Scaffold this active site. Sequence first.
Site, PDB file in Angstrom:
ATOM      1  N   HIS C 146       0.834  -1.202   0.000  1.00 45.21           N
ATOM      2  CA  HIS C 146       0.000   0.000   0.000  1.00 45.21           C
ATOM      3  C   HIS C 146       0.870   1.254   0.000  1.00 45.21           C
ATOM      4  O   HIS C 146       0.456   2.308   0.485  1.00 45.21           O
ATOM      5  CB  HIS C 146      -0.947   0.013   1.205  1.00 45.21           C
ATOM      6  CG  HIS C 146      -1.687  -1.271   1.407  1.00 45.21           C
ATOM      7  ND1 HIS C 146      -2.981  -1.465   0.967  1.00 45.21           N
ATOM      8  CD2 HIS C 146      -1.320  -2.429   2.004  1.00 45.21           C
ATOM      9  CE1 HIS C 146      -3.374  -2.682   1.283  1.00 45.21           C
ATOM     10  NE2 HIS C 146      -2.384  -3.291   1.914  1.00 45.21           N
ATOM     11  N   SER C 267      17.037  20.443 -14.822  1.00 46.58           N
ATOM     12  CA  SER C 267      17.309  21.853 -15.054  1.00 46.58           C
ATOM     13  C   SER C 267      18.780  22.152 -14.805  1.00 46.58           C
ATOM     14  O   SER C 267      19.478  21.372 -14.159  1.00 46.58           O
ATOM     15  CB  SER C 267      16.429  22.727 -14.160  1.00 46.58           C
ATOM     16  OG  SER C 267      16.526  22.326 -12.805  1.00 46.58           O
ATOM     17  N   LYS C 273      17.903  18.651  -9.439  1.00 44.93           N
ATOM     18  CA  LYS C 273      16.494  18.351  -9.655  1.00 44.93           C
ATOM     19  C   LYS C 273      16.341  17.670 -11.009  1.00 44.93           C
ATOM     20  O   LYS C 273      16.474  18.309 -12.052  1.00 44.93           O
ATOM     21  CB  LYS C 273      15.634  19.611  -9.595  1.00 44.93           C
ATOM     22  CG  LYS C 273      14.147  19.309  -9.689  1.00 44.93           C
ATOM     23  CD  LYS C 273      13.310  20.567  -9.620  1.00 44.93           C
ATOM     24  CE  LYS C 273      11.966  20.360 -10.307  1.00 44.93           C
ATOM     25  NZ  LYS C 273      11.147  21.605 -10.301  1.00 44.93           N
ATOM     26  N   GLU C 280       8.468   7.387 -17.022  1.00 45.85           N
ATOM     27  CA  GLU C 280       7.156   7.955 -17.286  1.00 45.85           C
ATOM     28  C   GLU C 280       6.645   7.599 -18.681  1.00 45.85           C
ATOM     29  O   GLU C 280       5.480   7.212 -18.856  1.00 45.85           O
ATOM     30  CB  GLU C 280       7.213   9.469 -17.103  1.00 45.85           C
ATOM     31  CG  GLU C 280       7.555   9.876 -15.686  1.00 45.85           C
ATOM     32  CD  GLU C 280       7.576  11.371 -15.497  1.00 45.85           C
ATOM     33  OE1 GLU C 280       8.451  11.854 -14.754  1.00 45.85           O
ATOM     34  OE2 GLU C 280       6.718  12.058 -16.087  1.00 45.85           O
ATOM     35  N   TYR C 307     -10.255 -15.339 -45.367  1.00 49.42           N
ATOM     36  CA  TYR C 307      -9.553 -14.067 -45.363  1.00 49.42           C
ATOM     37  C   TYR C 307     -10.508 -12.919 -45.648  1.00 49.42           C
ATOM     38  O   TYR C 307     -11.325 -12.988 -46.564  1.00 49.42           O
ATOM     39  CB  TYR C 307      -8.418 -14.067 -46.392  1.00 49.42           C
ATOM     40  CG  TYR C 307      -7.635 -12.771 -46.438  1.00 49.42           C
ATOM     41  CD1 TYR C 307      -6.538 -12.571 -45.613  1.00 49.42           C
ATOM     42  CD2 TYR C 307      -7.994 -11.746 -47.307  1.00 49.42           C
ATOM     43  CE1 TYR C 307      -5.820 -11.392 -45.648  1.00 49.42           C
ATOM     44  CE2 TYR C 307      -7.283 -10.562 -47.348  1.00 49.42           C
ATOM     45  CZ  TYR C 307      -6.197 -10.391 -46.517  1.00 49.42           C
ATOM     46  OH  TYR C 307      -5.485  -9.215 -46.555  1.00 49.42           O
ATOM     47  N   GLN C 312      -5.861  -6.993 -42.807  1.00 45.60           N
ATOM     48  CA  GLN C 312      -4.739  -6.107 -43.113  1.00 45.60           C
ATOM     49  C   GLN C 312      -4.425  -5.247 -41.891  1.00 45.60           C
ATOM     50  O   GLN C 312      -3.305  -4.765 -41.723  1.00 45.60           O
ATOM     51  CB  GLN C 312      -5.027  -5.219 -44.327  1.00 45.60           C
ATOM     52  CG  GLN C 312      -3.805  -4.421 -44.782  1.00 45.60           C
ATOM     53  CD  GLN C 312      -4.136  -3.314 -45.762  1.00 45.60           C
ATOM     54  OE1 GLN C 312      -4.919  -3.503 -46.692  1.00 45.60           O
ATOM     55  NE2 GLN C 312      -3.531  -2.147 -45.560  1.00 45.60           N
ATOM     56  N   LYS C 315      -1.250  -5.899 -38.719  1.00 44.74           N
ATOM     57  CA  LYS C 315       0.168  -5.551 -38.638  1.00 44.74           C
ATOM     58  C   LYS C 315       0.467  -4.277 -37.851  1.00 44.74           C
ATOM     59  O   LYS C 315       1.308  -4.288 -36.954  1.00 44.74           O
ATOM     60  CB  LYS C 315       0.755  -5.417 -40.046  1.00 44.74           C
ATOM     61  CG  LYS C 315       1.013  -6.742 -40.742  1.00 44.74           C
ATOM     62  CD  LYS C 315       1.453  -6.531 -42.179  1.00 44.74           C
ATOM     63  CE  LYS C 315       0.381  -5.813 -42.978  1.00 44.74           C
ATOM     64  NZ  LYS C 315      -0.826  -6.663 -43.159  1.00 44.74           N
TER      65      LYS C 315
END
Lengths: 455, 455, 455, 455
Positions: C146, C267, C273, C280, C307, C312, C315
């Site tokens: 948690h 920066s 920092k 991310e 088919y 198509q 892919k």
Amino acid sequence: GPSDALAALSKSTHFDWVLAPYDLTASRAHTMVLFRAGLLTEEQRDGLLAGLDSLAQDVADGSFGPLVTDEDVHAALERGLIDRVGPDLGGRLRAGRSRNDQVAALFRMWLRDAVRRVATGVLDVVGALAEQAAAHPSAIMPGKTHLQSAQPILLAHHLLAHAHPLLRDLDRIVDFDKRAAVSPYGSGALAGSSLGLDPDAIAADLGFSAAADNSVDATAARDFAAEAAFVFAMIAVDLSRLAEDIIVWSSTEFGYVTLHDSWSTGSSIMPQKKNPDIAELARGKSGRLIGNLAGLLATLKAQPLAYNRDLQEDKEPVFDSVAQLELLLPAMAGLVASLTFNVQRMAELAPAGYTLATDLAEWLVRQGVPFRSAHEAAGAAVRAAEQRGVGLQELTDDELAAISPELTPQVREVLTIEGSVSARDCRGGTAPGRVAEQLNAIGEAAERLRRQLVR
Amino acid sequence: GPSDALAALSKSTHFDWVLAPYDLTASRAHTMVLFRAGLLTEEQRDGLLAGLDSLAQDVADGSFGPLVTDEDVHAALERGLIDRVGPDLGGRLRAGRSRNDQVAALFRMWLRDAVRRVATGVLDVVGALAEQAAAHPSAIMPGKTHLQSAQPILLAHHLLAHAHPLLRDLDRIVDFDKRAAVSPYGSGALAGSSLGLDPDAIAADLGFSAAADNSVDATAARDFAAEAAFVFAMIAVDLSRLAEDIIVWSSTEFGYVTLHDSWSTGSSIMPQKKNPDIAELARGKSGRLIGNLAGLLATLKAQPLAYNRDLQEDKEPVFDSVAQLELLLPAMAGLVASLTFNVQRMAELAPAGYTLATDLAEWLVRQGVPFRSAHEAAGAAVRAAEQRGVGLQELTDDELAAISPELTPQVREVLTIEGSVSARDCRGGTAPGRVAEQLNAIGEAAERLRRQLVR
Amino acid sequence: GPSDALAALSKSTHFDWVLAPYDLTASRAHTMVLFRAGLLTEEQRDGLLAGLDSLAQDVADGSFGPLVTDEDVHAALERGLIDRVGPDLGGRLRAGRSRNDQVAALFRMWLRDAVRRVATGVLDVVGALAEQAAAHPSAIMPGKTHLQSAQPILLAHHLLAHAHPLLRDLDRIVDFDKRAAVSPYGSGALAGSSLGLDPDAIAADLGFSAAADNSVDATAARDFAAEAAFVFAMIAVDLSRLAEDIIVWSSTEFGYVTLHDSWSTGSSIMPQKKNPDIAELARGKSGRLIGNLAGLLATLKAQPLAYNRDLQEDKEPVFDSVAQLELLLPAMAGLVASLTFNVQRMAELAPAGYTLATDLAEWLVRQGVPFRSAHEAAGAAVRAAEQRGVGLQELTDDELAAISPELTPQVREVLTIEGSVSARDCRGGTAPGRVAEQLNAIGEAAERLRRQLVR
Amino acid sequence: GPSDALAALSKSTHFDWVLAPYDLTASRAHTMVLFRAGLLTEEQRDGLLAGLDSLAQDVADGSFGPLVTDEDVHAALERGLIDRVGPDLGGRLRAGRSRNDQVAALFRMWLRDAVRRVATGVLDVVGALAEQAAAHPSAIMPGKTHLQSAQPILLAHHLLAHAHPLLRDLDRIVDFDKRAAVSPYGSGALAGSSLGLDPDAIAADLGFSAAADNSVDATAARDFAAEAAFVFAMIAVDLSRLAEDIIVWSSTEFGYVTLHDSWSTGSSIMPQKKNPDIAELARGKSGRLIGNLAGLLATLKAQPLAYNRDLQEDKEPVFDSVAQLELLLPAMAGLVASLTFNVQRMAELAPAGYTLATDLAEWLVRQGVPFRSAHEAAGAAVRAAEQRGVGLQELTDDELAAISPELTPQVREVLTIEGSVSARDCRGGTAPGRVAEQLNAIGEAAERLRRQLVR
């Protein structure tokens, strides 16, 4: 500095270059803002605007494009402007800017243009459906439930039944745009601008309806992108319903329609064999756009405030969808416009299996006859019609009476497919008058939406 | 009849029994309509009405529910009605009734209520957030970007930044309801009704804004379901953002908040520790609702017109999405309300890592100083401060001038997190006045939406 | 002929060009087969082969690429082949060839390479994790449930806990490949070839493990692609878990890690920092790949045999996912390799909040005293330590006894995080010997997963 | 206490009660662990065993169920145990147990059973398909691509083409179980047990193939759930394909198949109508299961180690999927087995549109005749056949000789659909011998997946 893996991962020019005109307009607006802030004299404002319009032309004709060293379109355009007015003047423009509100704003502007291109496409498809409906207002086909024959309906009613979901989609677009028309410019990195700019003015000049009420949210929230993604997924799905219908119709077994040579792919040996590739690509595409939606939502999930690099992932799934639609909508339109209908086939299959039994029953129900009494009367009529290998209209008057004294000869008014569809003259019914009123209501609605989307 | 496998597959009484009051309302309305047509005598009117109120109250109290033999809620309800007014007398009510317009209509009627209960939950969360924002008019916390400390912001600004997305979702609900408020009654099984009934009046008495424009589309389309599912998923996602923030804040490392015992779980052995289970469940749930949406859209994909059994799958994913929200929304609203904010910890972390450096630069920028010079100046100031081990603020003028003569002591007005947030007095900025106006605005807007959803 | 909208819609050269080498290999093998069947003389085999090597080389170096008029990679490649060997020699290669088995086979081969690449990347990330695990053999951090401090664990144990799911993904890759390694060559359009060729031989020449058991299924089914998409989404999700951990650790509040400049964005005004942008991007892309999976599955849904042009769409999602991982996997592998671990911070936080009390309770339970009691004992110890303020290990023996007659002097051993983590000496435990054994095991498992991928 | 909202949100007894038997087997294993630890009195131990047996019988009869105050199945079951052996014999079983490995282990076991139930269902569907295939060994139907008639194929070949994906799914099941057979018992809450237990032994007694290698990962990972969800989604999609085929076949237009009364449904519109509900519900539920998969993956995304309450959301989608399949697999299996094929209709449609001309061309290609020459010849042959409205078989020997001297009368061999399908003798081909061998191979391979799933 940055590693190769990081540079290759973070690079976005290949898809985000479409944002360039909007970034340039943004730089113009910011130029005026800096002028009003006292941070730009006139000399400087003219220099910057001239450089921005030169860069705009060179971006338009293609003279200026991203380098491999460019991470994104914004770095690219600042680089170009610096190449056009020099670093001293160019560096003057960077005063009071943040990227976090910029990416959101630009995405919003681009999206408000794209949603209207897509809107145009939707109106194209609706137009094709309505035009075919008007071109074939009397053709009657078997209405299908569970792909089995139910009540006979006008072909027009079916096609327009494909038109309405798209009108609803346009309504969704109109509603979405209002939430899209909120400028985040002035939000800075997340905390709001300290430059003392006027967010309302900046919002007004760039074509937004209002400025954001919360900088953190303005820069962190991507729910507008999710809503757009959804609307596009919905359009794709509706298109896939239409597509499914056309594919099924195009089969030699059905033979409701015959495809155009220009709007389908044909076989080298089998001379009249045509495949509905456009419809199938639409159908397959809908899954794709659904995927873009679900993926975008998954990406936005569990995002701590405020901006994270996660949000850079907002554009590509949306972008793609638009692209697909920009390919799919006109194609489908043409595909709908080019359809040839085998109306004799549809009229042949419409009253099969003694479908019209239903109507008979319904008529009895309209005449105050008990519901069950009506339905076994209908069953009796069907049994007594497959008696002579004959239609229901063809049935002897005595039988109508021998099954029920309530069955006056008047019932024949609904024992033919023409009378059957003519009998359903309630609002939204397949009756000729109703379908006509529906068609013009579609025209007026389309006009109202298209009018509602102009800026 | 049907095989055991088919019967097992078709059974839906475990989830669709929630439609019962709506089916009963529809049956009463249809009693009126049938009587209006003259297909019913007065004694029957209130015969059926009495039977239906008996059935209604016996459905509310719990006396009457589905049996194992019942396939759906409709079969169950007419079984009850038959038990309460006679076997064929109840069969009179079947006159002019189809199942296809019925299932759509009832789903809609249920959904317009569900979406408003959900709206109440959302408004509860917004209320909690707004209240915590008001109860902390001066609390300052580190602004977060990449989960890294950016510019300092008001806690109120953060919480309200979680309030605005939910407001937008309320807006989405309001917009959706206009498309949901269209009655498909009179659309019959596929083509229109042939009974001469007025779809408009029926729509009016059942609480619909209008009747459908196309019977086929009215019985085939399920895009209102998809839109509802999307809006629910969006609400869930924004709730997942709020949840993420709370889960992060609750860590001993962050210590921004302390959870209430009632609204969290804990260990008996170590009392100080608590787990943010509600936020976690919200987070995990968001994915589930996203999945409901995605799945639903896959289901609606490639549907040939008109109605197919596939569409029965429209209910359960939406139901779930509502159910979950009806659990999550108050829970969250409790959590947020019960949160105790450790204001001094956040105030302490606010100017950390020399965050305020940024502000310094910005100050310089609005003094008419070049952007790069004003930033390296800041770097120098930060570097000098770091060696000294002191804050940017506790720095003599002579160093401010030794870094740049432009740095008058006035610059210090923004070296305090208070002056920092004070400087951002633009619309949607984190300045106390703007935040106050924003909070009042959030109140007025939430109230306005609440008003907009009443019928 | 074909309309502009249809041509635009059908164009695939922008993503499918990566299939060129595989198609040329296919044409090679097919040329050989054609000769030994008696359909080509040897001057024509020489001609065709030479043409195919020339075309292969020029495709490789880049001198030959697709024109705007080229619909797909195949049209382009035989355009080139015809330009290189004439229409009469090139047109004789088409013998016994159709699009439908060809496209499936090509996708299969490409996928069998791509999965391996991805496999290499996953092994890279695993390697970085193991490396950091070895570099920090005694570092103890607070274990998190948690996101709250549970029992202390070796940092190595946590990192390897991130290692194992990726091993499971590699296992999924090994299992996937076996279903992927089935040649559809010889299936024709759907019914199978009538040329009397040996599909198994062709399969062996192109690197397949077998030939398909059913031609129709061979050309129609795309479940292998869906499975690939899933394995990719799973990899991405696990990466998102790792990424989440890193993002939380990099926060100033946690301070568990410090990022490398080359593997993050930061920066220059605030030097230390740094933002965990890689993690991310991994996090959001995970959502993206999930989306691709869901969408692909939606596209395969309700596909009639055999088919359809729908296929198509198989892919582009898969491709995309692969691309993403090929950017994500090294990046992550770099990030993990570049991380600095503040072992003192983690170690300081490990025994906080009387965490270690649970270990003591477990020790009491082991003796066999009642579980409720031991817990009874432990809470007591917690507050007797709280008021005085001493760590649970700073309690005079006599003090330990007054609250339980079972607390001996020795019990102190599990009162230090080292002894406590060593106490957990069970397979999969966080004991040093155990984590060491599982590290060695991870090495062996990784290098065995590796071999089963070599063909 | 816990708030009402929190307790309502945390409640899982409505779906997790199915885990009870597994929880009891687990409590038995745990009683053995305690016995080995000597923490229990053998008199105590068999007291507990007797209690757990009693509880088992009580779950079997139904006398013991969960109450509204019970949060989950574990609380309920330990309440029951306490009510059966007293609070302090029952309080002694709690020794050394945490829920985080418990929930994962129980889920794993339940899943290992459910996956085999699903397996049996899949095998039933495969068996139905094989049954129908054998029942129609010489039936010839039009092969379909783009829902258009291509090369003629055997009905058996089509049905088996639906059979093979399911075999692949069984293979996926076999592969999955090996990753499912890893016991997380002994992993404690996070860091592992300190009880000095033997995880391998527990894993042995509970039916697992091995014990987990990392406690953190054993408690935190849910990729087994995601993979199960995927397998179920894939099965649902293949079923959706079969379903689509049947729904289209059941159309009056196609008339390929006629549905059985007990496996079909009667509209409320007409009684002489039989809709394919089972297939349609399969088609929609496929989307539903896709949604479960996507949603589950979304939930598992960005999960920090180790256990979070997010993971409680692992069960319900998976469960749902299983349930759906458990309704779908027998149903479908009946539906397929109950199908009546109109073989003459299909045979009549098989040689339509001069599709056999394809074969014609191919025949020429096999003779030594180059490709373009063959297609020229085929085109010409179609042009003659076409003028008199006659088949390619009808044309006299002289006309064929005239088109090309290579058209020896031996060509008629493939101008009959029987000879057409008999020309395709390569593996996977629609040749009756090949189809037979395929069927046998399918039988033994299915018996091989069934052997592999027996413990």
